[PDB]
Amino acid sequence: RFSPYAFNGGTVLAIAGEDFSIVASDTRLSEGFSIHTRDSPKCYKLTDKTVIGCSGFHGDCLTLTKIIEARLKMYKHSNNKAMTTGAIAAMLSTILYSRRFFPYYVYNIIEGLDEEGKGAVYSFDPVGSYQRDSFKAGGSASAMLQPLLDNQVGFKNMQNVEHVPLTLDRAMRLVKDVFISAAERDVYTGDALRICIVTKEGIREETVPLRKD
Amino acid sequence: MSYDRAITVFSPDGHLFQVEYAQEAVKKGSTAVGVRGRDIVVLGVEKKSVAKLQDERTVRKICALDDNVCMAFAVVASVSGLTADARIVINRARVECQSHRLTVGDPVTVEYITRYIASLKQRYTQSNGRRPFGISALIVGFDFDGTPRLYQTDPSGTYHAWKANAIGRGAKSVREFLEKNYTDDAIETDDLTIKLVIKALLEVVQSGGKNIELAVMRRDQPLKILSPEEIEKYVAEIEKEKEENE
Amino acid sequence: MEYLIGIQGPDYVLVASDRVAASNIVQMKDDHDKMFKMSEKILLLCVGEAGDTVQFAEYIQKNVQLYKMRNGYELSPTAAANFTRRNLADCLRSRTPYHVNLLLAGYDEHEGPALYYMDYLAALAKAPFAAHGYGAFLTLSILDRYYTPTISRERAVELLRKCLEELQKRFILNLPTFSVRVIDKDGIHNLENITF
Amino acid sequence: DRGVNTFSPEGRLFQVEYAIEGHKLGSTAIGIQTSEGVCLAVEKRITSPLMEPSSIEKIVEIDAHIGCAMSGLIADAKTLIDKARVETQNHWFTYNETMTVESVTQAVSNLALQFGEEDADPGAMSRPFGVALLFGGVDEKGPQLFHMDPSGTFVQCDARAIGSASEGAQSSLQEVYHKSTTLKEAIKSSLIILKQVMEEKLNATNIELATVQPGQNFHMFTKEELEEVIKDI
Amino acid sequence: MSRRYDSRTTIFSPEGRLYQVEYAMEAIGHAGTCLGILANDGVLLAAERRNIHKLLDEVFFSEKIYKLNEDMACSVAGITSDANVLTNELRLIAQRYLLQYQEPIPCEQLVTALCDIKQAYTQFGGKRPFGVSLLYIGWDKHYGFQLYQSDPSGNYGGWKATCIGNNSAAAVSMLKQDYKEGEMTLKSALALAVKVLNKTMDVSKLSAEKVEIATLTRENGKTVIRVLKQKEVEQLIKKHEEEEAKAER
Amino acid sequence: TTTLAFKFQHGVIVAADSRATAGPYIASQTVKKVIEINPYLLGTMAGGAADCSFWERLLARQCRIYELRNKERISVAAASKLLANMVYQYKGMGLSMGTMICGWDKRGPGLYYVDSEGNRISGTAFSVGSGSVYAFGVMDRGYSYDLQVEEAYDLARRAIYQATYRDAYSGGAVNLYHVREDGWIRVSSDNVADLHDKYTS
Amino acid sequence: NQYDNDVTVWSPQGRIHQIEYAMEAVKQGSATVGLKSKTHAVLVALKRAQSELAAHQKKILHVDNHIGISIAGLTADARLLCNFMRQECLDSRFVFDRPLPVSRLVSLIGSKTQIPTQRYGRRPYGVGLLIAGYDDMGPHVFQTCPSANYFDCRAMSIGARSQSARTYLERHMSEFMQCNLDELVKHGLRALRETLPAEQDLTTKNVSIGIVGKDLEFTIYDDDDVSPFLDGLEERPQ
Amino acid sequence: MSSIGTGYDLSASTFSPDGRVFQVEYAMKAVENSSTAIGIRCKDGVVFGVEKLVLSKLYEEGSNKRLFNVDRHVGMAVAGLLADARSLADIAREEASNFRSNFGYNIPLKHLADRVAMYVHAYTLYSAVRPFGCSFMLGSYSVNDGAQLYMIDPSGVSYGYWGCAIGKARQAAKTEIEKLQMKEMTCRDVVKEVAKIIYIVHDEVKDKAFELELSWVGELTKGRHEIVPKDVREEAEKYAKESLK
Amino acid sequence: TQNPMVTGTSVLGVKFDCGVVIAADMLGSYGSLARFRNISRIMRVNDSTMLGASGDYADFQYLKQVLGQMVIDEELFGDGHSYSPRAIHSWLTRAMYSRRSKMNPLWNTKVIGGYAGGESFLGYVDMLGVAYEAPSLATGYGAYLAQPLLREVLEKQPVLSQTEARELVERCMRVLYYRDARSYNRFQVATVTEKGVEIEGPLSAQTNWDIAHMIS
Structure with a gap:
């Protein structure tokens, strides 16, 4: 998975944290190729249905490509069951897409966050290569490594303590999402324009913008 | 052309014409009996249609498809002793069996080939122009597990396992006959397993035991065809006990 | 270098064959206790030697194919025929993106042409001859058979020749003495001979 | 030369009316839905005790956790199941x-009427399914049993019995079972009803019992396992 | 039955038992006799050609007995039109076998390859059944000289003496009767071949215009197959002729 | 005999292990990565190297082992399942590979172990390890080896391997996942941290 | 009889009977109402059943969570189109990424249903389908019948004795556009009651209701989830 | 009998002793069951006028599909079995779609009509699919040869017309068109003219109660096939009502 | 992140969306590498009576797209009597085509901007060489996206949508800047507006000049 030419090295990071009764998912709305921004609109969070909201990040084209796949399966399972499904279905359908592009895999990371039809709110990571896991908190992309240390010290707490030595509270996680986004702007040179945070209850999305530049 | 003539018409009978009709052929020409034993599941045939100038190597009425599964058949139709229809079915079923080994190893189970064969005739009922094969094969074998199985397929393609089952020269008659002979003792003992086969064959005895050809097959091991000469040894003694029951 | 060691000594009827167990991937022996000598039947045995993948894949396929021929004719596959048959197979396979090349030895007794033992090259060149080796060892194993016997000396002395060849396997190439799979194939079937 | 389909003047397919009559000839299938599992009970249609009850294709697996029981033409059912089976195992691999x-x-109801040959299609059938199926399996909302019949009528069922007398099979279900009650009793009710449509009195040999639970999932029963559920007649 | 549900092979019998094959067997009887006898240094085939007419171009000596391979030959009894596709097919199979096996092809193997095509035509594909019985003659080193009989349906059997054509029933029993085993030689099987061919056939004279005779003889361990030319054929006929003549008034 | 995913045979149980993070790269995808997974419920596996490579073969395997089971209605040989995996990984070879599986399941003779390699091999052996760095692993476990390992002895063995392997090596990380299979019912033994196991042993 | 055994046998009228015989299955099958406002599209269905130990047959089907159908006729033919339509939807978000227009799909199915009525002997699909949908344009109530002819209609009712429902729709042509989600549903029940005898009215258990519109996505209401919609019982004349 | 309704139509692989198969003659009867579609050709476009048979007044636009848009300069007004009407629409349209891609220009009607006509006859030949049994017109305004009007009947015959009508009142209607002028005059004058012919021909033993639909394809709509506006439609209709009485 | 060496380029396609209209300016010049072969060139096409399409970057890749969008539009209008196609389906399906052709490493970029209204909404869609669809206040693709779009962004930043007069002054400012800063192009623009009747935009004419910094 590489993009100097073949795929879009269009930067951008989303971070999603699951508590156990919300997901806050925060991403920039800048679409850019290389260090340059192409155009200032277009949010990288996209809602497949209404009851699920996915965040796709890396190249924007790859992001549009992944949502379609997650969306066409997300409806199919809903039709069949006659009742909705959410978080769990998006990760699991990625497994199928990842097999599809076995020979050269799509450099996009989709993280579906909403509530699953098995219960309790879930922000799940598949990566475009294959593999599935549930995370405690996770931020993913080409700057993936930058959220990870915040989540690793607080949420996992493997010979560490932070605010509480337990997976962090709803009030703290929403603040933590806002926090990382400011820090990213200095450090990284692709993050720009405004950061839009979507908080999902499991059925509905609310959006709040924050300017940073 | 007429509605009745056509291959498509589900008929007042409530079942497709060509499937029904293939089922009414499983008596006459050749006879195949197979009984289940612990150490050998044994099939025997009577009538290979040999004048005894005809090669017995060419005509297979007992052919091993795998290295632990073998089958013997009989059937009804136009022109006696008809090698052809049975022979295509041996060729596709045996290759498929070898292909199964290559895909997913060790000798392939009795029940799986039997499932494949029953479905093979079935798919044909959908397929263009194709009626199902009228054949019932007594699939005789041992599993890789070593659990002895005796399976039988029918012309529509529904299969059932049995302890002991007989077909041909009137299927219903030979099935009924075999049920008096079968006992739980018969399955345990190695001498009785052979005699049980021979005992169903004899109610349409033709030309010695040299006409009758038996094979024993073991857990993972190739088909061993007992000599045309050995078979005769059982028949002379048994045939006398046979007269009394019917 | 071509491939790891093999040494094979045909007696004059019997053929005594050995290959290392050592099927090594990365830098460890994954397997070290299994025979990659295949029973394609009882009257014919084929012993496939080469890379790790081509050995198991080509022979397992061949085996199931051997059995199919047996049913059809109702006689064991013919030995002469098997010698040409293995040459068409290995040339056809050879182009495939996953590389197939086998240094093969067919051993059979047939009631037809007779006995056959086949030397077969890495250039998919078929020859019957008596004395064969596998790997860059084919040159090493053929050479001691030319001088020290006229390739009609007893199997017992041949074993002593084999012990000396195996000592080379410790010296010139990398393989350790630890395990070698040894089988002698004659008319009856395969006989398990002692490991080294 | 000729067509395929023939509508009767009544306004319905001739071949579909025949297909219903097709059901009357064969095995029986009863499925009883409980929130603790779905059990499927079917007869093989016996004639000798030499016929094993150990392993007989009447209850077959669509998925690892879905079992399907057939009535009507048995043979043809195994082809319907195979098509459903490929779709179902791909979905299972993906969804987990x-x-x-x-x-x-x-999906199966699509195979009922699709058939063409005689200058239409070589890939489509020459016959209608005269199979009726009970798909009983365990799902995320709960354990569900669905009924399909030769007309293609997909309906959801809490409890359905179908057999060689469709009126008979259900009427016995009215007497014996009631929607809500233990898992053990649902099996109990399947067997009583099964005996009623069937000629002969119940025995271990005549039937095969397979229960699909969220707790055990599909189990194909062998002879020792059969004796246990027989205890409750 | 009371009406066939055949009129195509993309629709099938009202019994599921194929009438067309019994009419095919009758078709061999309509056509002239084909017989094969075994020898202890060869095998020979004798067949009655379609052409009886005086005017023959005679560029071919093979018009019912076709040499397929460098080890095997076959003959036709039945429709000539059918052989032409079959004969070219048989050439492909016969050389196909050599490519992989490179062995003196056995008669049982060639026949099973062909039987696959004949059984499919009768089952589906809308192709009319065959009406030829073919007699394959060949040598292998594992059983010897062999003769096989193939039927329109795909039904096969290994023989060492068999006859079909000009009432099959009579002919096979007669060919057997006069056949002896282990007492034979190629010249005497050939003299005998004309004699038996004469009796099954209505003619009491028979000529090389009426008949075409082939040898398969093994020389220096390899099989040389030739279909013989007319002057050579006549000599086998004249040998027989003296005996035939004494029978007559 | 490669990577921090190991399986070795003995008749009492089979222990199947993998880490959380065996260093399939240089980094973690998220906070926690799982490798130790069984989509089956009667078979055990090994698999290391890349991220993609173990996940694909085993999900592929789940479909293939059920599909045979579904039709025949009795469970298929361990050898039949392993040969299925073997054919499939060979296709997968060269696009992303270093993966192999070590198969345990019940077969006819008894409990069976076949190790299928990324090449196209199906072999039985004393011990195999799936991925790339058990080449440095071999000795310590190799000193205390025997054919038969008890249930009690197997746990003492894996625990220590990771403790010494923190000292020698580093690719060992995060948590140690231990799974014990009786033959057709796996249970999750202990999910002990790699660091924690360094401290005791 | 003879025309419909084949299809290539044409009539002395000049119209094929196979299509006409196929229409009569629609008369056998369940009564349905499909109505639209101009913000919403409502599917009000009558469920029929084989057992009352089993749950009454769901006659609102999910094609997508924005278009749904209600079926009248042969069920096997219905399900076949159900799946066909479902895949088309999936395809439409997959490539185009939007909610499929009802109008693109009725025309597409109308092309496909014509093909087997022309194929030798083959059926025209003996099922009439009412597709209720709300896409980006607004609501559409579409008829596909066994004839490949489709209608764009504001409100129509297809199935058994639906004619009686159609007459009440004509009186209330004006009311539809004007009506709210609640109000439009009460008219569907009024229309649906006509279908049934003057001895009886609607029960909760034989009614299935499907709502898609501006207010909410396509949700199908089952056996007793129909209730908040249900309340409104109007005239049935003798 | 010039036709048999059972015998020589059992398959679509038949001919008849006169030379024309009976299935095709029946296919002209299928068009008789429906109302009339008239289309009169200008030199600035074509204007269609079809009467659409109604059973309800809950019908909205895109119902019955009497007017189809084959292209962005090709219009189609149809008559006969609506079921059949959709496939003929596909056949013309697919030919148009391939044409547009490759050739890259507006289609000449002289080529389209013969090209389509081949296809309509091609179903008749086959017994894989039955003859068509709806009749259509193609009317186009292009710079390729001007305004041109063709009619293709289900047999597969294509002919030129300045005025064609296909229906059950095609014979009575065609004569009526010949008496009026419309040949040289604009689409705006013509629309009025297409409406009146429909009312005057309109019999109660060949047609039933109808709502009028008329359509443009000419210079006013800038090539493209659109339906006439309601306001304009009603003035064209207002003359149509007056003209009958 | 990509940009093939273009041979025949249209450098700039200007676009600002207003209340029921769009104003687009499209470069007259067609550079075929350094040589400007053809000025006359309007790159805005008429698909149908309520849609228009304007593209910048390779012109060849454009001419291949105009006929294809023509056959997609021709399938969709058939279904109605006067139905017209919405911007989003045609533009998004083309997006999937360009994402695939980008992965194929020898290819040439084009970036188009579609304006249509086929819904109950006026849609402004883009398909890019990289691919994506979005809404935009004011848009420019290719060489506009790189240098004027940022000037536009600057404007857009405190005042979300500009006025008519202010967009005209910018246009005039812009053409100077492109001739001066980028090569291939010329000052020469065609003013094209799309409305509910079709696209109207006559031939490209010369407008304000200034390649002088002698005066600066």
Whole structure:
């Protein structure tokens, strides 16, 4: 998975944290190729249905490509069951897409966050290569490594303590999402324009913008 | 052309014409009996249609498809002793069996080939122009597990396992006959397993035991065809006990 | 270098064959206790030697194919025929993106042409001859058979020749003495001979 | 030379009316839905005790956690199941949760009327399915049993019995079972009803019992396992 | 039955038992006799050609007995039109076998390859059944000289003496009767071949215009197959002729 | 005999292990990565190297082992399942590979172990390890080896391997996942941290 | 009889009977109402059943969570189109990424249903389908019948004795556009009651209701989830 | 009998002793069951006028599909079995779609009509699919040869017309068109003219109660096939009502 | 992140969306590498009576797209009597085509901007060489996206949508800047507006000049 030419090295990071009764998912709305921004609109969070909201990040084209796949399966399972499904279905359908592009895999990371039809709110990571896991908190992309240390010290707490030595509270996680986004702007040179945070209850999305530049 | 003539018409009978009709052929020409034993599941045939100038190597009425599964058949139709229809079915079923080994190893189970064969005739009922094969094969074998199985397929393609089952020269008659002979003792003992086969064959005895050809097959091991000469040894003694029951 | 060691000594009827167990991937022996000598039947045995993948894949396929021929004719596959048959197979396979090349030895007794033992090259060149080796060892194993016997000396002395060849396997190439799979194939079937 | 389909003047397919009559000839299938599992009970249609009850294709697996029982033409059913089976195991690989019993039911009903040959299609049938199926499996909302019949009528069922007398099979279900009650009793009710449509009195040999639970999932029964559920007649 | 549900092979019998094959067997009887006898240094085939007419171009000596391979030959009894596709097919199979096996092809193997095509035509594909019985003659080193009989349906059997054509029933029993085993030689099987061919056939004279005779003889361990030319054929006929003549008034 | 995913045979149980993070790269995808997974419920596996490579073969395997089971209605040989995996990984070879599986399941003779390699091999052996760095692993476990390992002895063995392997090596990380299979019912033994196991042993 | 055994046998009228015989299955099958406002599209269905130990047959089907159908006729033919339509939807979000227009799909199915009525002997699909949908344009109530002819209609009712429902729709042509989600549903029940005898009215258990519109996505209401919609019982004349 | 309704139509692989198969003659009867579609050709476009048979007044636009848009300069007004009407629409349209891609220009009607006509006859030949049994017109305004009007009947015959009508009142209608002028005059004058012919021909033993639909394809709509506006439609209709009485 | 060496380029396609209209300016010049072969060139096409399409970057890749969008539009209008196609389906399906052709490493970029209204909404869609669809206040693709779009962004930043007069002054400012800063182009623009009747935009004419910094 590489993009100097073949795929879009269009930067951008989303971070999603699951508590156990919300997901806050925060991403920039800048679409850019290389260090340059192409155009200032277009949010990288996209809602497949209404009851699920996915965040796709890396190249924007790859992001549009992944949502379609997650969306066409997300409806199919809903039709069949006659009742909705959410978080769990998006990760699991990625497994199928990842097999599809076995020979050269799509450099996009989709993280579906909403509530699953098995219960309790879930922000799940598949990566475009294959593999599935549930995370405690996770931020993913080409700057993936930058959220990870915040989540690793607080949420996992493997010979560490932070605010509480337990997976962090709803009030703290929403603040933590806002926090990382400011820090990213200095450090990284692709993050720009405004950061839009979507908080999902499991059925509905609310959006709040924050300017940073 | 007429509605009745056509291959498509589900008929007042409530079942497709060509499937029904293939089922009414499983008596006459050749006879195949197979009984289940612990150490050998044994099939025997009577009538290979040999004048005894005809090669017995060419005509297979007992052919091993795998290295632990073998089958013997009989059937009804136009022109006696008809090698052809049975022979295509041996060729596709045996290759498929070898292909199964290559895909997913060790000798392939009795029940799986039997499932494949029953479905093979079935798919044909959908397929263009194709009626199902009228054949019932007594699939005789041992599993890789070593659990002895005796399976039988029918012309529509529904299969059932049995302890002991007989077909041909009137299927219903030979099935009924075999049920008096079968006992739980018969399955345990190695001498009785052979005699049980021979005992169903004899109610349409033709030309010695040299006409009758038996094979024993073991857990993972190739088909061993007992000599045309050995078979005769059982028949002379048994045939006398046979007269009394019917 | 071509491939790891093999040494094979045909007696004059019997053929005594050995290959290392050592099927090594990365830098460890994954397997070290299994025979990659295949029973394609009882009257014919084929012993496939080469890379790790081509050995198991080509022979397992061949085996199931051997059995199919047996049913059809109702006689064991013919030995002469098997010698040409293995040459068409290995040339056809050879182009495939996953590389197939086998240094093969067919051993059979047939009631037809007779006995056959086949030397077969890495250039998919078929020859019957008596004395064969596998790997860059084919040159090493053929050479001691030319001088020290006229390739009609007893199997017992041949074993002593084999012990000396195996000592080379410790010296010139990398393989350790630890395990070698040894089988002698004659008319009856395969006989398990002692490991080294 | 000729067509395929023939509508009767009544306004319905001739071949479909025949297909219903097709059901009357064969085995019986009863499925009883509980929130603790779905059990499927079917007769093989016996004639000798030499016929094993150990392993007989009447209850077959669509998925690892979905079992399907057939009535009518037995043989033809195994082909319907195979098509459902390929769809279901691909969905199971992908989802790793459950493959809706309802979807599977909807999919099979497509195979009932599709048939063409004689200058239409070589890939489509020359016959209608005269198979009726009970797909009983365990799903994320709960354990569900769905009924399909030769007309293609997909309906959801709490409890359904179908057999060689469709009126008979259900009427016995009215007497014996009631929707809500233990898992053990649902099996109990399947067997009583099964005996009623059937000629002969119940025995271990005549039937095969397979229960699909969220707790055990599909189990194909062998002879020792059969004796246990027989205890409750 | 009371009406066939055949009129195509993309629709099938009202019994599921194929009438067309019994009419095919009758078709061999309509056509002239084909017989094969075994020898202890060869095998020979004798067949009655379609052409009886005086005017023959005679560029071919093979018009019912076709040499397929460098080890095997076959003959036709039945429709000539059918052989032409079959004969070219048989050439492909016969050389196909050599490519992989490179062995003196056995008669049982060639026949099973062909039987696959004949059984499919009768089952589906809308192709009319065959009406030829073919007699394959060949040598292998594992059983010897062999003769096989193939039927329109795909039904096969290994023989060492068999006859079909000009009432099959009579002919096979007669060919057997006069056949002896282990007492034979190629010249005497050939003299005998004309004699038996004469009796099954209505003619009491028979000529090389009426008949075409082939040898398969093994020389220096390899099989040389030739279909013989007319002057050579006549000599086998004249040998027989003296005996035939004494029978007559 | 490669990577921090190991399986070795003995008749009492089979222990199947993998880490959380065996260093399939240089980094973690998220906070926690799982490798130790069984989509089956009667078979055990090994698999290391890349991220993609173990996940694909085993999900592929789940479909293939059920599909045979579904039709025949009795569970298929361990050898039949392993040969299925073997054919499939060979296709997968060269696009992303270093993966192999070590198969345990019940077969006819008894409990069976076949190790299928990324090449196209199906072999039985004393011990195999799936991925790339058990080449440095071999000795310590190799000193205390025997054919038969008890249930009690197997746990003492894996625990220590990771403790010494923190000292020698580093690719060992995060948590140690231990799974014990009786033959057709796996249970999750202990999910002990790699660091924690360094401290005791 | 003879025309419909084949299809290539044409009539002395000049119209094929196979299509006409196929229409009569629609008369056998369940009564349905499909109505639209101009913000919403409502599917009000009558469920029929084989057992009352089993749950009454769901006659609102999910094609997508924005278009749904209600079926009248042969069920096997219905399900076959159900799946066909479902895949088309999936395809439409997959490539185009939007909610499929009802109008693109009725025309597409109308092309496909014509093909087997022309194929030798083959059926025209003996099922009439009412597709209720709300896409980006607004609501559409579409008829596909066994004839490949489709209608764009504001409100129509297809199935058994639906004619009686159609007459009440004509009186209330004006009311539809004007009506709210609640109000439009009460008219569907009024229309649906006509279908049934003057001895009886609607029960909760034989009614299935499907709502898609501006207010909410396509949700199907089952056996007793129909209730908040249900309340409104109007005239049935003798 | 010039036709048999059972015998020589059992398959679509038949001919008849006169030379024309009976299935095709029946296919002209299928068009008789429906109302009339008239289309009169200008030199600035074509204007269609079709009467659409109604059973309800809950019908909205895109119902019955009497007017189809084959292209962005090709219009189609149809008559006969609506079921059949959709496939003929596909056949013309697919030919148009391939044409547009490759050739890259507006289609000449002289080529389209013969090209389509081949296809309509091609179903008749086959017994894989039955003859068509709806009749259509193609009317186009292009710079390729001007305004041109063709009619293709289900047999597969294509002919030129300045005025064609296909229906059950095609014979009575065609004569009526010949008496009026419309040949040289604009689409705006013509629309009025297409409406009146429909009312005057309109019999109660060949047609039933109808709502009028008329359509443009000419210079006013800038090539493209659109339906006439309601306001304009009603003035064209207002003359149509007056003209009958 | 990509940009093939273009041979035949249209450098700039200007676009600002207003209340029921769009104003687009499209470069007259067609550079075929350094040589400007053809000025006359309007790159805005008429698909149908309520849609228009304007593209910048390779012109060849454009001419291949105009006929294809023509056959997609021709399938969709058939279904109605006067139905017209919405911007989003045609533009998004083309997006999937360009994402695939980008992965194929020898290819040439084009970036188009579609304006249509086929819904109950006026849609402004883009398909890019990289691919994506979005809404935009004011848009420019290719060489506009790189240098004027940022000037536009600057404007857009405190005042979300500009006025008519202010967009005209910018246009005039812009053409100077492109001739001066980028090569291939010329000052020469065609003013094209799309409305509910079709696209109207006559031939490209010369407008304000200034390649002088002698005066600066």
